[PDB]
Amino acid sequence: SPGIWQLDCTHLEGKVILVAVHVASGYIEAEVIPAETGQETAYFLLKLAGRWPVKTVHTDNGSNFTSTTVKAACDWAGIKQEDGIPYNPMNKELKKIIGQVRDQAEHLKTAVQMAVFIHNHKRKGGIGGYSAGERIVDIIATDI
Amino acid sequence: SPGIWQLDCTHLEGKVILVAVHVASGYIEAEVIPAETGQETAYFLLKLAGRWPVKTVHTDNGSNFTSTTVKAACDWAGIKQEESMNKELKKIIGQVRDQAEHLKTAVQMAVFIHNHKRKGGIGGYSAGERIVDIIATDIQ
Numbered sequence: 001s002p003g004i005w006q007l008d009c010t011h012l013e014g015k016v017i018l019v020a021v022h023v024a025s026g027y028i029e030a031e032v033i034p035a036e037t038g039q040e041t042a043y044f045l046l047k048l049a050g051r052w053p054v055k056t057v058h059t060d061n062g063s064n065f066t067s068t069t070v071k072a073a074c075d076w077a078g079i080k081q082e083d084g085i086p087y088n089p090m091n092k093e094l095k096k097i098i099g100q101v102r103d104q105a106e107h108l109k110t111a112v113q114m115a116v117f118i119h120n121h122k123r124k125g126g127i128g129g130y131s132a133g134e135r136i137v138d139i140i141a142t143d144i
Numbered sequence: 145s146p147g148i149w150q151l152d153c154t155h156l157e158g159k160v161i162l163v164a165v166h167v168a169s170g171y172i173e174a175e176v177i178p179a180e181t182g183q184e185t186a187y188f189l190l191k192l193a194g195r196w197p198v199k200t201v202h203t204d205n206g207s208n209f210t211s212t213t214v215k216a217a218c219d220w221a222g223i224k225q226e227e228s229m230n231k232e233l234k235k236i237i238g239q240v241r242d243q244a245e246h247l248k249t250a251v252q253m254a255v256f257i258h259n260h261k262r263k264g265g266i267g268g269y270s271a272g273e274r275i276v277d278i279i280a281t282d283i284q
């Protein structure tokens with residue numbers, strides 16, 4: 001469970017936003033990519049696996065994940081890819097925040113990173129609670 | 145401090161790699177960009193700050209760090225602007241550069257290897273373990 005991420009795509013303004021959610025914390029990483037190809041998807045997974053200890057990804061089983069490049073990436077990084085496993089702990093939420101910052105950014109992808117910043121820093125559960133960024137480091141830390 | 149990063153660039157096969165090192169842990173994030181621009185730097189910093197608690201970035205004097213889009217991004221994200229890993233990362237990049245068609249793939253394989261690599265014997269830690277242990281400790 002600390003090694004499990006759910007990957008999902010969302011489309012806005014004709015563009016593709018690939019999102020990785022750390023299931024146990026709600027923490028997200030995201031990128032805007034030109035189309036859902038094997039190469040972009042593999043590169044996105046490789047980057048994520050280099051930044052956090054990714055043991056398992058649940059995907060929507062879209063055709064980008066059935067590509068050979070994506071399989072080679074997961075094997076190289078030691079990720080187990082589980083296609084078609086539902087999200088059970090977000091795209092609605094990211095879009096609402098993107099709407100709150102959209103008029104401050106000349107380009108969508110800047111707005112998407114602003115929204116990821118706001119999501120990951122936001123304290124959940126009233127004033128004594130913790131943000132998704134706080135939660136992920138507390139769950140992953142091995143030697144506190 | 146847990147919030148202190150150092151950023152810089154390195155040049156290879158005609159491309160620019162932007163590297164950020166979390167100074168207290170040695171953990172890195174890196175991206176290959178077409179050219180070292182103000183827009184690319186700004187976007188890089190915003191991504192970094194959404195992913196980790198970034199207070200201060202130490203940079204070189206380049207005009208890409210001082211553009212008005214970089215200042216807007218830093219004001220918005222709360223970032224205040226003001227060694228060897230460039231050289232270590234480079235080393236690893238050559239070590240795997242053949243397992244990959246594209247430079248940007250080899251760069252991210254190198255980031256992966258660097259962040260996962262246990263330093264010392266049994267009892268040691270990787271850079272990824274140090275940064276999470278540092279921040280988690282700071283949070284309590």
Ligand SMILES: OC[C@H]1O[C@@](CO)(O[C@H]2O[C@H](CO)[C@@H](O)[C@H](O)[C@H]2O)[C@@H](O)[C@@H]1O
Nearest residue numbers: 031032033034040044109175176177188
């Ligand atoms: O969204 C494009 C944006 O991302 C950057 C990295 O900072 O480009 C890299 O990451 C993208 C998302 O994974 C990839 O599509 C791209 O191929 C990769 O180089 C920026 O340079 C770019 O503006």
Ligand SMILES: Nc1cccc2nsnc12
Nearest residue numbers: 120121133134195196197
């Ligand atoms: N990664 C993190 C740790 C502690 C707080 C944070 N806010 S955003 N990312 C965070």
Ligand SMILES: Nc1cccc2nsnc12
Nearest residue numbers: 051052053259272273276
């Ligand atoms: N962010 C991280 C925490 C623990 C181990 C890791 N390896 S790569 N990034 C990591």
